[PDB]
Write a protein that binds this ligand. Sequence first.
Ligand SMILES: [Cl-]
Ligand SMILES: [Cl-]
Lengths: 204, 201, 193
Amino acid sequence: RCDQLEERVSAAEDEINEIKREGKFREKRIKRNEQSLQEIWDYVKRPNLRLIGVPESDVENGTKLENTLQDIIQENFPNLANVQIQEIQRTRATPRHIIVRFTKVEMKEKMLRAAREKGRVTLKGKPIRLTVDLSAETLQARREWGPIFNILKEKNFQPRISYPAKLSFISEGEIKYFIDKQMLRDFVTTRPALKELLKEALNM
Amino acid sequence: QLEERVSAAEDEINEIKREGKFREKRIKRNEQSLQEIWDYVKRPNLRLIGVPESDVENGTKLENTLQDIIQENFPNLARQANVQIQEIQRTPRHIIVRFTKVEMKEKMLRAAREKGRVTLKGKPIRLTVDLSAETLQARREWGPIFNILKEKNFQPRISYPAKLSFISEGEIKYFIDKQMLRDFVTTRPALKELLKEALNM
Amino acid sequence: LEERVSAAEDEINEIKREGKFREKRIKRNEQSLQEIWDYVKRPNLRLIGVPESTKLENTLQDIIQENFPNLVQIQEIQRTRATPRHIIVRFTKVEMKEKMLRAAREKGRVTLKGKPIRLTVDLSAETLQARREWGPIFNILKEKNFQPRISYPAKLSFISEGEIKYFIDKQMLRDFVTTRPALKELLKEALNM
Ligand SMILES: [Cl-]
Ligand SMILES: [Cl-]
């Protein structure tokens, strides 16, 4: 009995190690799928702008929303007649975001540009906001660049966040781009000045 | 010493069960997110079902056929401005029509639903929303129930995987099986009268 | 302790079974990701070897004028080191991508300011790999003047009996040669049959 039982234990331990290993390779594929989903949501949303702070209106259909979109243009960047939209719609004191899906990505990029060169954008004198529309995960990665961004800003590096969630800044007469925080760590680990500045923020 | 090895094995087993449940939740999230992005990408599209196909076709022949369907079934819809198509192609195979504006896809779908019986040269065809296989299958699992609700303004939605929800009494309700829906409607005369035939009641 | 080991074995068996069910859904998801990436990228063409500097759209028209006499709506054109990045041209109609690719494959050489560049498809990783894997079979069929072609997503087509036949994958082609002996003899080893 002690023989049949010891052999039953050994087999089980071996099946356990097999399971842990299959688990690791399964984990790797799920992660790869999660990253691929984030990327495709980002890709498919590229033609999209989020309009934030625009007052709700009664029986507000697509024609009304385009008309409002044109009022925003006239008030902030007049020369930016009719711009091409695949779709536009809202997503209770606080008005819902409007998601504007352009026919051509170039139109989305030109309106973003004009908005970031203008600083304050307004509809009838009150501040509205224009931003990109991204997967939840990328949106979060941008937010988490927050602390590092502010440090770089404070210390004259001219930071930017761009698509998808890349931080960029100047380092040696040149714009450097960092796709994620690990690619930044591997860059600062070489520059001492930058390293002591970002050490805590990079959780290095 | 056996007892030691058994304890150790039981502990490793508990760790694997939890890891496994963690992975299962993420696999489910990924499945749901795939259903959503398929639905999202197909928003500008309609499926045109039952259209006779030819030995060889291209975009131009198919677009002239869409024009015939419009002229034959809802001409006024195209009176003031032409229907803007971005592209049209086969997957008699389904034809996928991709509109420039989602607004136009919606206008045409509505005219089809309000005409009832859409034909091409006298023969019945169908215009329908284009969706992920999952969402389509979910809507068929609910059958006519889903469409009666749509047609009476109840805002029905599929939620992953195949749950039905809609709004009644100013509250969103979710249903997993038809049985749950039956239980719910036995108390609502307005809603009961509408869905009885459809819930096999 | 026998009860405890029997129970552990039951747990292990449940974990393995529940693991294969999970594994099949991971596979399902991987395949579904392949298909949605192919679908979304279907009107895309990739430009390789174009030097770095509306300008991109201008460059596209430049390439078109310089190379393809007969031959244009775009949804997006964008760049993806010393080597210039690829340019992804996202056409409005899949048909335009196809015509650009045909004209490139026919002209056999494509140039910008007289320097050779490459036009190619832009598809999921899995599908690009599937195309590359038709290589050995494509090469053989080309040699024997079967006029083979690889097209969307990863289908092989070629002339058999004056008629073009299409193969979604290698299994479909194996099934096809089970009843054509000379063709089977030709592709037997390439098909790992
Ligand atoms: Cl997964
Ligand atoms: Cl697992």
